[PDB]
Amino acid sequence: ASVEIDDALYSRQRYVLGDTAMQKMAKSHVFLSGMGGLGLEIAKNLVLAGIKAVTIHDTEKCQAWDLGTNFFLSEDDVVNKRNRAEAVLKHIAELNPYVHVTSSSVPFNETTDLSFLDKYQCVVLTEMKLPLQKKINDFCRSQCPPIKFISADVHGIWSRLFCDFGDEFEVLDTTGEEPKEIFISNITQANPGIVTCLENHPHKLETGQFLTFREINGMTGLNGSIQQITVISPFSFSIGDTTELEPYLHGGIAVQVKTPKTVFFESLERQLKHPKCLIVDFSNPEAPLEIHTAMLALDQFQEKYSRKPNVGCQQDSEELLKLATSISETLEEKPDVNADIVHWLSWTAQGFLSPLAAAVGGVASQEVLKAVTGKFSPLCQWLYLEAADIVESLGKPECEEFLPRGDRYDALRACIGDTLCQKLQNLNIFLVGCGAIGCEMLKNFALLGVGTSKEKGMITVTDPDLIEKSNLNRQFLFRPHHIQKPKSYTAADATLKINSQIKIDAHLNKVCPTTETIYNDEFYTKQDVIITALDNVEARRYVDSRCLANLRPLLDSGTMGTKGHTEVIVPHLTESYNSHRDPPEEEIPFATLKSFPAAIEHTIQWARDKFESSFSHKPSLFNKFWQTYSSAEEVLQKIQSGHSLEGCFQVIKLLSRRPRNWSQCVELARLKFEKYFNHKALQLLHCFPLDIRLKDGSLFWQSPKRPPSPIKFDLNEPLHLSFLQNAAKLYATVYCIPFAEEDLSADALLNILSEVKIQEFKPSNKVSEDERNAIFQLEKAILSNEATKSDLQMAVLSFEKDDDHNGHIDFITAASNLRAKMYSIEPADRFKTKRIAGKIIPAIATTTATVSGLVALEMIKVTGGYPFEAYKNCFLNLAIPIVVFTETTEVRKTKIRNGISFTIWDRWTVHGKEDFTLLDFINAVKEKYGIEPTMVVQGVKMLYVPVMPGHAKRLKLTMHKLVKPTTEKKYVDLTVSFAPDDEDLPGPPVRYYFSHDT
Ligand SMILES: Nc1ncnc2c1ncn2[C@@H]1O[C@H](COP(=O)(O)OP(=O)(O)OP(=O)(O)O)[C@@H](O)[C@H]1O
Ligand SMILES: [Ca+2]
Ligand SMILES: [Ca+2]
Ligand SMILES: [Cl-]
Ligand SMILES: [Mg+2]
């Protein structure tokens, strides 16, 4: 458990799961049976996660039908009749090199001995008969430690997932949240001793919980101790004898210790008779047990007749209903059978829906990780995902639509029908972003057949970014030899490997207004659907605005660690993304960042800002100044003449104080350290001593503020040497100074610093000339030949969180922690500071696969033009686990009294002529739509307000003069507000047309 986890590959996953959990995965061997789409999806997610060893088992040989459900199989494999597991093994191995993947072709029978399974910690079973599953479940739960058991299957549009980790299973962390921290006001010297908490915040503890202690002064003995506590009252608890310990003074933090929690699982047989579920939708509470009855009936039918129901066959469907009614009588609550679920299960049972399998596989993969690590709360036995909304809106369809045509889409055709398959083939989709969700979506397109008709199919994928190692953890199309290559291009070539017929147009562009020429209104109207795999709200709002303008549907999705969400936006049926409450995340006060920090977050922000200011902004301004004003002699002449040059002062100082060699950079780092962590504290203490109190009679340096303490530089201390080394390197690269690791040695730095250290004890600040000083500096520089063109140029650094060599993160961490030490806030690790400073989002493959599969199901509904009832928005948290499906937000229709009602999608149109005035436009809007404009705006430009200066003049002005198109386009779009209400009300966009010629 001392292995070094590769942060370069698993950086985001480490934020989701934690190093300890990953270390447990590094020891885990998992056995997976059945290599259909579901099994391959699960194996893919587990291998990417880093499970030490995955055994891949299948008895069946490749067929054409498999080519539709398997994204690594080939026609060559089908012709040679290779084993499904053996054919795909190298491709799966390529996903994670650290993992060891092995294939088994051993037949699995009742006669077969199950002893071999003892090597594995977890067993996942797909495409296996229920009787043998029960036998393996008994074997696995009877072992000690018990082998954890998962059973997963997808039949048509219905799915079944089961988890049994043993009669007793230990959940080490339930939510994944950091443990709560309590602050100690006092601790008594008594038997038992009593710990007391700050009166502002109660501890909210339990009389049995265990707490660890740190940062106590006086009672130094308690630090590092774990004590089981007894709650005396809110704000007070009893730990144990403290009389022998030294008397308490101040401080102290108590952190709760997570105690392993026991969860109990019943066997597969017991659960089949009496199943357990977490019911999410109380609109349909009985749905899961009805699906359970139908799926169990399907298993009984498979046993009796050794085959699944045929599409259309009434004898088979009637027999399945009989078996379901019998099962319902055996079930404890005598649940009434659902005929629709049984009918559709018989109808689609021979089909396989790949998007649903992607979703189920993501959920099942997370369950495997839960079994081997204990990191999250496990599925409490059953999950029954369904795609019933896809088949319900079709109506009563022709059984011939769902009959095979001898092509790879037979599986999909058995679930959704040939007509919708063809609609998917004849599709124009715009995929904005090609990240984790983008890669999963491209796989789901290739298996669904999207854009495969040559004549009228196209998938447009656009991304500006290049591939990185950290991406490889969750972007399975990309591989290590693709690093530093465009994402869109690489994904397109891989997607073509999955499906040769697919048509993909790949771009390296960013979807912003600058590229609106490439992605114009014509382009959007051509596109049947737009799907956003973005990471920022600004891009989502821009694409949402574009979709609203061109009345096209948008599918939006996102992943945060184990959390995920899907949003479906359909024109004229649902509300759009821009309709949200759009709250800004945070707005730290300048005072709290630059003078009075209270949190490690504040200091990390200050360190990031200092990195950008020192090594990006100032170099950029320096280069721009000298290129704009050419020679230094010309700049001096301009300054003496009296011309105004922006930023002359700072640039001249930088040129005067420019480092020329490594020792100068080391000196600069030392002086900057002194200014940041010594002088700032003393100057703040001078303007504001601890004694001053007058905000409210007698108040200052209260609980929010922290008084600073000066820091004394010691090269022996670790943070000090780290700051010096990384700061000097960064300054040196900015000023193009050559240096070597020999220079970075602490001994060499000590010879530079201690021998030649000028540290004057500066007095407090508070305790024409500047222009002349700059003139003197510039004069001396040009005189000494120091202002050569080479010295008037600097190098600009770009913050890169993912390069350990560059030293950006190490400088930020040292600066943040040194500032924290000054204000006494507790430090943060390098990786925690990296996450905060780089705004890294925790990400894992299971969640992205789950979210993407769900979005693909919604895309199927959108291509069929389904009703509002069918579309569903989703929120998933795989930690709980919970999946919440809600009806999509209904389009809001706003009507002003005696006005035409309007929605986000509607745009009102008014026509213009050569002789037209603002008053004419106002009257025209009132005539056509029944409501009178009381405000007119173009862009940010204000055209009309009734309560404004000179409103009457503007009312009669001609429209062409009032607008300033420049484009001299056929129309200009104006925003309109109406008075009725004591505030103005927004109205639909009004489009004015300059040319009519009628
Ligand atoms: N306006 C835009 N147009 C096109 N692609 C965009 C736009 N904005 C962001 N993207 C892309 O959206 C994708 C989002 O996916 P993802 O979360 O994996 O990003 P990432 O950079 O790989 O994240 P991380 O930094 O955690 O590795 C990225 O490929 C990013 O390049
Ligand atoms: Ca339904
Ligand atoms: Ca990137
Ligand atoms: Cl500075
Ligand atoms: Mg991103």
Tab-separated table of N, CA, C and O in Angstrom, residues 530 532 540 544 554-558 565-570 574-580 851 855 858 872-875 888-889:
chain	number	residue	atom	x	y	z
A	530	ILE	N	-28.495	19.782	-31.550
A	530	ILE	CA	-27.233	20.282	-31.019
A	530	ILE	C	-27.031	19.677	-29.638
A	530	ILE	O	-27.968	19.629	-28.836
A	532	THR	N	-24.263	19.644	-26.311
A	532	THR	CA	-23.168	20.389	-25.693
A	532	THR	C	-22.446	19.520	-24.668
A	532	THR	O	-23.044	19.086	-23.676
A	540	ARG	N	-22.220	27.488	-22.827
A	540	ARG	CA	-23.568	26.935	-22.819
A	540	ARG	C	-24.595	28.018	-23.128
A	540	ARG	O	-25.525	27.794	-23.906
A	544	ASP	N	-26.914	28.112	-26.379
A	544	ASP	CA	-28.348	28.146	-26.110
A	544	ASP	C	-29.013	29.311	-26.831
A	544	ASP	O	-30.122	29.171	-27.359
A	554	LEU	N	-31.601	21.518	-28.169
A	554	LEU	CA	-30.301	21.456	-27.506
A	554	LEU	C	-30.337	20.425	-26.385
A	554	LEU	O	-31.279	20.393	-25.588
A	555	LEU	N	-29.303	19.589	-26.323
A	555	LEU	CA	-29.119	18.621	-25.248
A	555	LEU	C	-27.858	18.980	-24.471
A	555	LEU	O	-26.759	18.968	-25.034
A	556	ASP	N	-28.011	19.260	-23.174
A	556	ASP	CA	-26.921	19.726	-22.323
A	556	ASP	C	-26.686	18.733	-21.190
A	556	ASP	O	-27.638	18.213	-20.612
A	557	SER	N	-25.416	18.430	-20.898
A	557	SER	CA	-25.088	17.490	-19.829
A	557	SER	C	-23.808	17.901	-19.113
A	557	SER	O	-22.955	18.588	-19.679
A	558	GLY	N	-23.670	17.449	-17.861
A	558	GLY	CA	-22.469	17.745	-17.096
A	558	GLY	C	-22.204	16.748	-15.991
A	558	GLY	O	-23.129	16.118	-15.464
A	565	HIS	N	-25.775	15.313	-14.529
A	565	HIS	CA	-27.063	15.894	-14.898
A	565	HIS	C	-27.251	15.951	-16.412
A	565	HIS	O	-26.290	16.133	-17.169
A	566	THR	N	-28.526	15.838	-16.829
A	566	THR	CA	-28.953	15.963	-18.220
A	566	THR	C	-30.142	16.915	-18.298
A	566	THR	O	-31.057	16.839	-17.465
A	567	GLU	N	-30.127	17.780	-19.324
A	567	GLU	CA	-31.150	18.781	-19.607
A	567	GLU	C	-31.521	18.724	-21.083
A	567	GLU	O	-30.637	18.807	-21.943
A	568	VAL	N	-32.821	18.622	-21.372
A	568	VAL	CA	-33.343	18.543	-22.738
A	568	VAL	C	-34.128	19.820	-23.020
A	568	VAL	O	-35.046	20.168	-22.267
A	569	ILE	N	-33.756	20.524	-24.095
A	569	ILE	CA	-34.364	21.791	-24.497
A	569	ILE	C	-34.941	21.577	-25.885
A	569	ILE	O	-34.190	21.367	-26.846
A	570	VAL	N	-36.262	21.643	-25.998
A	570	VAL	CA	-36.972	21.348	-27.235
A	570	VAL	C	-37.734	22.601	-27.636
A	570	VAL	O	-38.432	23.178	-26.801
A	574	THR	N	-40.229	23.341	-24.152
A	574	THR	CA	-39.491	23.424	-22.905
A	574	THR	C	-38.789	24.768	-22.824
A	574	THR	O	-38.554	25.445	-23.829
A	575	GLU	N	-38.470	25.144	-21.599
A	575	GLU	CA	-37.697	26.344	-21.352
A	575	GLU	C	-36.223	26.079	-21.666
A	575	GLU	O	-35.772	24.932	-21.726
A	576	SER	N	-35.473	27.159	-21.878
A	576	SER	CA	-34.093	27.069	-22.339
A	576	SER	C	-33.111	27.244	-21.180
A	576	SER	O	-33.494	27.516	-20.040
A	577	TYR	N	-31.821	27.061	-21.497
A	577	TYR	CA	-30.760	27.166	-20.494
A	577	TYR	C	-30.641	28.580	-19.936
A	577	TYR	O	-30.369	28.760	-18.745
A	578	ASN	N	-30.841	29.598	-20.773
A	578	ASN	CA	-30.698	30.979	-20.318
A	578	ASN	C	-31.779	31.412	-19.328
A	578	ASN	O	-31.649	32.487	-18.730
A	579	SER	N	-32.836	30.625	-19.158
A	579	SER	CA	-33.918	30.904	-18.218
A	579	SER	C	-33.557	30.618	-16.757
A	579	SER	O	-34.394	30.853	-15.878
A	580	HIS	N	-32.369	30.083	-16.475
A	580	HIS	CA	-31.958	29.747	-15.116
A	580	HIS	C	-31.708	31.000	-14.272
A	580	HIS	O	-31.692	32.131	-14.768
A	851	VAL	N	-24.044	9.467	-17.698
A	851	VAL	CA	-24.691	10.686	-18.176
A	851	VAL	C	-24.839	10.644	-19.690
A	851	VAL	O	-25.890	11.005	-20.241
A	855	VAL	N	-28.142	10.888	-22.184
A	855	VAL	CA	-28.341	11.923	-23.199
A	855	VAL	C	-28.669	11.289	-24.545
A	855	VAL	O	-29.499	11.804	-25.302
A	858	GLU	N	-32.248	10.434	-24.788
A	858	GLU	CA	-33.053	11.626	-25.060
A	858	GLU	C	-32.927	12.059	-26.519
A	858	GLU	O	-33.890	12.554	-27.118
A	872	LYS	N	-37.315	13.572	-20.548
A	872	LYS	CA	-37.009	13.576	-19.123
A	872	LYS	C	-35.626	14.184	-18.887
A	872	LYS	O	-34.672	13.879	-19.608
A	873	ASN	N	-35.534	15.048	-17.876
A	873	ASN	CA	-34.281	15.573	-17.350
A	873	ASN	C	-33.811	14.679	-16.216
A	873	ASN	O	-34.625	14.056	-15.532
A	874	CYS	N	-32.494	14.589	-16.030
A	874	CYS	CA	-31.963	13.645	-15.050
A	874	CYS	C	-30.966	14.291	-14.105
A	874	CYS	O	-30.188	15.156	-14.515
A	875	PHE	N	-31.018	13.867	-12.835
A	875	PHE	CA	-29.967	14.119	-11.852
A	875	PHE	C	-29.534	12.798	-11.234
A	875	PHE	O	-30.368	12.066	-10.699
A	888	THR	N	-39.252	17.461	-18.068
A	888	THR	CA	-38.489	18.646	-18.435
A	888	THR	C	-39.286	19.923	-18.169
A	888	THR	O	-40.519	19.932	-18.201
A	889	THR	N	-38.558	21.011	-17.893
A	889	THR	CA	-39.179	22.275	-17.497
A	889	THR	C	-40.077	22.815	-18.607
A	889	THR	O	-39.631	23.026	-19.740
